Write a protein that binds this ligand. Sequence first.
Ligand SMILES: NS(=O)(=O)c1c(F)c(F)c(S(=O)(=O)CCc2ccccc2)c(NCc2ccccc2)c1F
Ligand SMILES: [Zn+2]
Length: 258
Amino acid sequence: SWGYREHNGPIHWKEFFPIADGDQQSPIEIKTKEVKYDSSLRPLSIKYDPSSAKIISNSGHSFNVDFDDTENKSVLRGGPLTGSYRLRQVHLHWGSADDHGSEHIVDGVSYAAELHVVHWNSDKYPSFVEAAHEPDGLAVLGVFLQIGEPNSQLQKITDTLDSIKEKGKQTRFTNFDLLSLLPPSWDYWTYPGSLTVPPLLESVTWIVLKQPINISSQQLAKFRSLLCTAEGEAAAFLVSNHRPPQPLKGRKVRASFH
Ligand SMILES: NS(=O)(=O)c1c(F)c(F)c(S(=O)(=O)CCc2ccccc2)c(NCc2ccccc2)c1F
Ligand SMILES: [Zn+2]
């Protein structure tokens, strides 16, 4: 029963998930003056098939778009990764107001929201759930969202939100154009970290894109009408679902670009 309310939110997660105070926790603050370009990163390769998307659901902590994950039709390769990481899921973090809501923060700048694209190493591991317990098991792309003119590529998502208002609701979601949610430039920072939700496993290679995409205020507010509660339960709203940055504790952040 972890969440982002007073009693169950990020400050208390260490109570049930001791790795919360680990050495490779996410998200982080990126201090660009201390980041080093790395010419050894390969081009990032994103191959995504809209037909791989299957369902969207309200997990109680965000919406999750889940992808068919026994095929290599949608994979992330290149960059800092060895081998092929299979697309598993997309979800979004925001705050209760537009001025902050991202998980990563760049030279003290906090965007309105942050989209995460979760992939796992099917070249080494038998399932997403196994790969989540391995250091090179997961790769997550982060995209920032900044308040600006509305983004038409969010429509397929926002159109489904009334249907998944309560925790545990789901609805069919295919032919999703994920590629078009990414910004035009894919320059990124990368570092070793963790899931930003319980169980907070340290199995993620983060790839955080420098260029934000837009969202309007009116679009972002729709996400905050989702509930963190199930049907028949006193309603509570998911107005904020972002973890604060954790300390780098010795890790260094690399950049794809100079
Ligand atoms: N913030 S994040 O991008 O790190 C991330 C993930 F990488 C991730 F894989 C997930 S998850 O839905 O696949 C659940 C995490 C997990 C992984 C392996 C074993 C157990 C749990 C969520 N979170 C969305 C979510 C949270 C809770 C319940 C259902 C979905 C998630 F938020
Ligand atoms: Zn996330």
